[PDB]
Amino acid sequence: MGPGFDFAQAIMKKNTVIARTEKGEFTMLGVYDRVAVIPTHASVGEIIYINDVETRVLDACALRDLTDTNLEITIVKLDRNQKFRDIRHFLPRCEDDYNDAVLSVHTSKFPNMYIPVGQVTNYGFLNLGGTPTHRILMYNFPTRAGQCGGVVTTTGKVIGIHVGGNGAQGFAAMLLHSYFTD
């Protein structure tokens, strides 16, 4: 409907797949080559479904900060026959606050879903499902089950993936450029 929604759509139409694990269906962001991200609570194993096709997992790494605290991001390398558009130049270099963000989801339950969430706070620490977690972004939107892995964008930046909510607030794990240096 406006320039925030334009950027978000451009990311969804080329840089997402539907991922299925034994723990559910997730929006999955492809970042470059055969590398994608998903919330760590998806519990990615040796095999994953990508757009309903059986796909071998070449590598999966559940990220933690240097204090050995959960970041809720798992980086997956997929045995896929096609590369993602390289979007690393849209990733922020540092932790930050943002204005006017969009959360975008694409699953069987919620196809082509876009939500204007407004202001995003560098929240920092969150006890997420009982797990101490760092680098959390917060938005004051009543997010619901089925949105995990959703992509959080501003104009020109891909800033996080949705990992949880408390009924009134939603929470995303930051994406940083430094997670995807090669």
UniProtKB/Swiss-Prot annotation:
Protein's cellular compartments: Host cytoplasm
Active site positions: H41 (for protease 3c activity), E72 (for protease 3c activity), C148 (for protease 3c activity)
Domain annotation Peptidase C3: ranges: 2-180
Top-level taxon of origin: Viruses
Catalysed reactions, as listed in the record: Selective cleavage of Gln-|-Gly bond in the poliovirus polyprotein. In other picornavirus reactions Glu may be substituted for Gln, and Ser or Thr for Gly
Complex formation: Interacts with host IFIH1/MDA5; this interaction inhibits host IFIH1.
Protein function: Major viral protease that mediates proteolytic processing of the polyprotein. Cleaves host EIF5B, contributing to host translation shutoff. Also cleaves host PABPC1, contributing to host translation shutoff. Binds and inhibits host IFIH1/MDA5, thereby inhibiting the type-I IFN production and the establishment of the antiviral state. Cleaves host MAP3K7/TAK1, resulting in inhibition of TRAF6-triggered NF-kappa-B induction. Cleaves host TICAM1; this interaction allows the virus to disrupt host TLR3 signaling. Cleaves host IRF7, resulting in inhibition of type-I IFN production.
Designated name of the protein: Protease 3C
Organism field: Human enterovirus D68
